[PDB]
Curated annotation (Swiss-Prot):
<feature type="domain" description="Peptidase A1">
    <location>
        <begin position="17"/>
        <end position="328"/>
    </location>
</feature>
<keyword id="KW-0732">Signal</keyword>
<keyword id="KW-0865">Zymogen</keyword>
<keyword id="KW-0378">Hydrolase</keyword>
<feature type="active site">
    <location>
        <position position="199"/>
    </location>
</feature>
<keyword id="KW-0645">Protease</keyword>
<keyword id="KW-0064">Aspartyl protease</keyword>
<feature type="active site">
    <location>
        <position position="35"/>
    </location>
</feature>
<dbReference type="GO" id="GO:0004190">
    <property type="term" value="F:aspartic-type endopeptidase activity"/>
</dbReference>
<dbReference type="GO" id="GO:0006508">
    <property type="term" value="P:proteolysis"/>
</dbReference>
<comment type="similarity">
    <text>Belongs to the peptidase A1 family.</text>
</comment>
<protein>
    <recommendedName>
        <fullName>Endothiapepsin</fullName>
        <ecNumber>3.4.23.22</ecNumber>
    </recommendedName>
</protein>
<feature type="disulfide bond">
    <location>
        <begin position="255"/>
        <end position="290"/>
    </location>
</feature>
<keyword id="KW-1015">Disulfide bond</keyword>
Length: 330
């Protein structure tokens, strides 16, 4: 089997992407944030505290003839941005782009933090990291991809995120019309539960490539590109007026600037992020100070290849017995 679904930016900055997902019988369609950096499929629901729902579409398990309470199971998750959610668990039928999994754990939110409430466009998350990070207790649950894997034509999914435009998540096949050149594959460590790999270096604009190993994660659920302080300083030093602002919480630059591109290495190959992709717009409405799309990871503890980086490529998440990542230009 295969699946194919369109993924759409939630706003004009590409802050996140939503993909429609069918849950239950009859289908309830919710728009979920596919997140290769976490491993829980959780949804706003009829159980979510009413004051914490503001415009989201909810899953109502009592209206699904295939929903079953997973007795005793609870979940609770906290993300790198300080947001969180928690609740109980049902199993139900879940379909993405024509690919159907029965018995998928659907984590029903009883509580969500303010940032989720405030984002009416995101009805929940669909985690695509390794199932060892799933938070369900006392019996850890499998991701949608893990449950679908055996049925797929090939044990893979691909992320093709758009710049200010729709893109695609495919399951079970490589669309060879969706990229240019060849796909370069690179080793993955699953030891932290992430799609964790080592970039071979970087360049700023037309500058020379610096060979240096950068360990990080491919994370569709993170907006920006977080890299070591040395790398980020070298980038922003090429932008007149750019500075790190403790009050704003990162590098900012004049909105009148034209930004240089940023290149990262995948083996001997190179992925170029156009400068425009690094502009995240005014820090506040109407400001002439703009927020940078490349930020320091020094306070995180891990480097993060988020959407800024991934949307410059066609990305293969290869869930074979030994997992690997593939990157192609597009």
């Amino acid at each position: 089997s295969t699946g194919s679904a369109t993924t759409t930016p939630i706003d004009s900055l590409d802050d996140a992407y939503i993909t429609p997902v069918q849950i239950g019988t009859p289908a309830q369609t919710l728009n979920l944030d596919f997140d290769t950096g976490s491993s829980d499929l959780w949804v706003f629901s009829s159980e979510t505290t009413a004051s914490e729902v503001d415009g989201q579409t909810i899953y109502t398990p009592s209206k699904s003839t295939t929903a079953k309470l997973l007795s005793g199971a609870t979940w609770s998750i906290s993300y790198g941005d300080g947001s969180s959610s928690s609740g109980d668990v049902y199993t139900d039928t879940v379909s993405v782009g024509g690919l159907t999994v029965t018995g998928q754990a659907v984590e029903s939110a009883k509580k969500v933090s303010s940032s989720f409430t405030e984002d009416s466009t995101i009805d929940g998350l669909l985690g695509l990291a390794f199932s060892t990070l799933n938070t369900v207790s006392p019996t850890q649950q499998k991701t949608f991809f893990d449950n679908a894997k055996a049925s797929l034509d090939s044990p893979v999914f691909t992320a093709d995120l758009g710049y200010h435009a729709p893109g695609t998540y495919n399951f079970g096949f490589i669309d060879t019309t969706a990229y240019t050149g060849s796909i370069t594959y690179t080793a993955v460590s699953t030891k932290q539960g992430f799609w964790e790999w080592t970039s071979t270096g970087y360049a700023v604009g037309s500058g020379t490539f610096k060979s240096t190993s950068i360990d990080g994660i491919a994370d569709t659920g993170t907006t920006l590109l977080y890299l070591p302080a040395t790398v980020v300083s070298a980038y922003w030093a090429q932008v007149s007026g750019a500075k790190s602002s403790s009050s704003v919480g990162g590098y900012v630059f004049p909105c009148s600037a034209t930004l240089p591109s940023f290149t990262f290495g995948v083996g001997s190959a190179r992925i170029v992020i156009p400068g425009d992709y690094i502009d995240f717009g005014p820090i506040s409405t109407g400001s002439s100070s703009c927020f940078g799309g490349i930020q320091s990871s020094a306070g995180i503890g891990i480097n993060i290849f988020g959407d800024v980086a991934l949307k410059a490529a066609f990305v293969v998440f290869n869930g074979a017995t030994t997992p690997t990542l593939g990157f192609a230009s597009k």
